[PDB]
Amino acid sequence: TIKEMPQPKTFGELKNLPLLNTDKPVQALMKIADELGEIFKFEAPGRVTRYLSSQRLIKEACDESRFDKNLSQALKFVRDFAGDGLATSWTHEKNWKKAHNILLPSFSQQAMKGYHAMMVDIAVQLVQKWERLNADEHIEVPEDMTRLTLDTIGLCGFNYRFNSFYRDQPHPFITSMVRALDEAMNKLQRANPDDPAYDENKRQFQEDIKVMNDLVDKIIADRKASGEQSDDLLTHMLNGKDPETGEPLDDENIRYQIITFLIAGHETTSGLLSFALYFLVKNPHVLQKAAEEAARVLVDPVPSYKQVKQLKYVGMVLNEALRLWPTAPAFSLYAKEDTVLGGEYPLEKGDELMVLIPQLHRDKTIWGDDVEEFRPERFENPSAIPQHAFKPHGNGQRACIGQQFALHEATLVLGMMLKHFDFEDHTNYELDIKETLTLKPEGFVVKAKSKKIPL
Numbered sequence: 350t351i352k353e354m355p356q357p358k359t360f361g362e363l364k365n366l367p368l369l370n371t372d373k374p375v376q377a378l379m380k381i382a383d384e385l386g387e388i389f390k391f392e393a394p395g396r397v398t399r400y401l402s403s404q405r406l407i408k409e410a411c412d413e414s415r416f417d418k419n420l421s422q423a424l425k426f427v428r429d430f431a432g433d434g435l436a437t438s439w440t441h442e443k444n445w446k447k448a449h450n451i452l453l454p455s456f457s458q459q460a461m462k463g464y465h466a467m468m469v470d471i472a473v474q475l476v477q478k479w480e481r482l483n484a485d486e487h488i489e490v491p492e493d494m495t496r497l498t499l500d501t502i503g504l505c506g507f508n509y510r511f512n513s514f515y516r517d518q519p520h521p522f523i524t525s526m527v528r529a530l531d532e533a534m535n536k537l538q539r540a541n542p543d544d545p546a547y548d549e550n551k552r553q554f555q556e557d558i559k560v561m562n563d564l565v566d567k568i569i570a571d572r573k574a575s576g577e578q579s580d581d582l583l584t585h586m587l588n589g590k591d592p593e594t595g596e597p598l599d600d601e602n603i604r605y606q607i608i609t610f611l612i613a614g615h616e617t618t619s620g621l622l623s624f625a626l627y628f629l630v631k632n633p634h635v636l637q638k639a640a641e642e643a644a645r646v647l648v649d650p651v652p653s654y655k656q657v658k659q660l661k662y663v664g665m666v667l668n669e670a671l672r673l674w675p676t677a678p679a680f681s682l683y684a685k686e687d688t689v690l691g692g693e694y695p696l697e698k699g700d701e702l703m704v705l706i707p708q709l710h711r712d713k714t715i716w717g718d719d720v721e722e723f724r725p726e727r728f729e730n731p732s733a734i735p736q737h738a739f740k741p742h743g744n745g746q747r748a749c750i751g752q753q754f755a756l757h758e759a760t761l762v763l764g765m766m767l768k769h770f771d772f773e774d775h776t777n778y779e780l781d782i783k784e785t786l787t788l789k790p791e792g793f794v795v796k797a798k799s800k801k802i803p804l
């Protein structure tokens with residue numbers, strides 16, 4: 350009955366920690382899952398977790414009566430600058446449910462209608478950039494997709510223009526963001542984060558937290574002294590009141606939310622768009638089908654909210670890209686009470702789980718033997734997909750609050766991309782996945798041939 354779960358190779362007192370001493374640790378954990386199966390123990394000094402890779406077990410871990418969201422070490426280090434914003438707070442901290450209640454209406458399908466015009470603004474800047482490239486120039490795909498999604502969250506969220514398409518070199522806030530995210534992730538591997546080798550990293554980390562707080566606090570202060578009532582997240586946050594506590598967010602927590610949304614904008618949707626275009630150029634028949642939908646639906650020079658809603662195949666393209674390469678590749682859980690997982694693995698209250706999403710999405714008992722194939726038609730009927738087989742936005746009440754935002758922006762942009770250009774994988778690009786907070790293709794380049802359709 351009770352099975353003892355495998356564990357990858359250890360390093361004396363360092364346990365399994367040195368296995369994360371790599372620049373692609375998620376992909377390294379995936380290969381361990383290939384070797385060891387649906388569940389394996391992973392220990393570091395002072396920490397134990399268990400990596401889940403099968404739908405059989407993950408469907409139990411997604412039972413919210415038995416498991417709640419845990420902060421991974423990664424999220425604990427990001428909390429150093431994202432605070433108790435939505436993504437780095439515990440479910441039982443008062444500011445989680447309060448910010449959740451206040452911000453839910455800002456992220457609904459209905460709220461998407463109000464953001465649509467300003468996502469079209471940024472999306473048009475992307476298309477015009479590509480229309481203006483010279484023959485036999487190429488597109489740096491993740492770079493441009495990150496320019497897009499950062500600008501979109503800046504504009505839709507806070508009425509601020511990062512003007513990323515006017516730049517080679519990030520806005521100063523983004524420089525500190527990206528550097529702080531890099532330190533947070535690199536910190537995870539250090540066997541001794543106290544060696545003086547890491548003193549400068551420590552110094553630079555604190556400078557970046559200060560640059561980030563000071564610029565956000567200024568934006569908050571400036572908006573409050575202004576009165577301007579633009580329909581953006583910062584206004585809803587300054588004006589909204591939690592129905593439960595009846596309280597609004599305070600300025601410190603609003604700062605944390607803004608940092609949180611900007612991290613999410615920069616990191617996740619740009620990865621998704623990059624992986625989707627990669628899969629489309631590697632699967633020309635799928636690109637054809639999606640381009641045909643784009644041409645048939647996007648019949649005006651600017652897309653409308655209604656038309657984006659009818660880009661249904663583009664949506665399953667995005668879902669299939671999230672299946673093979675979920676850009677936020679894991680989440681962590683803890684047992685609310687003693688419980689037995691899958692009838693085989695007893696857990697005590699407090700025990701942690703890691704959900705390894707890319708491996709879940711390769712569970713052959715779920716998707717069949719063509720699991721590595723890019724086939725958006727898998728998603729034709731969600732009722733034919735078993736429970737909790739597909740988890741790119743997390744689980745339950747702690748699922749991605751920005752899920753509709755991301756899919757509206759990604760659908761609109763990919764739709765316009767397919768309306769306006771033919772794409773050529775001119776380098777026969779070999780997929781290379783760089784890991785930061787999230788997963789992104791690195792070095793992915795294509796050529797676009799304009800269809801010469803006016804905007």
Ligand code: HEM
Nearest residue numbers: 435436613617618621677680741742743747749750751755
């Ligand atoms: C396709 C792109 C995206 C993916 C794959 C994604 C995925 C996820 C996942 C897996 C989680 C749960 C993490 C955990 O349980 O520890 C999450 C949480 C979250 N995401 Fe997203 N996300 C995306 C886009 C966005 C965007 C655009 C925003 C907002 C601008 C956003 C805001 C959040 C927030 C605030 C949370 C924490 C929510 C809460 O716990 O209340 N995400 N996301």
Ligand SMILES: CCCCCCCN1CCC[C@H]1C(=O)N[C@@H](Cc1ccccc1)C(=O)O
Nearest residue numbers: 374375393396398421422423677678679786
């Ligand atoms: C927000 C985007 C997703 C971030 C998810 C984490 C993304 N990690 C980045 C590296 C792999 C992955 C992960 O498995 N992390 C674990 C690592 C860990 C486990 C046990 C002991 C020490 C450290 C953790 O952070 O605890």
Ligand SMILES: C=Cc1ccccc1
Nearest residue numbers: 427431436609612613
């Ligand atoms: C820290 C921000 C964040 C945003 C989305 C998912 C996980 C983390």
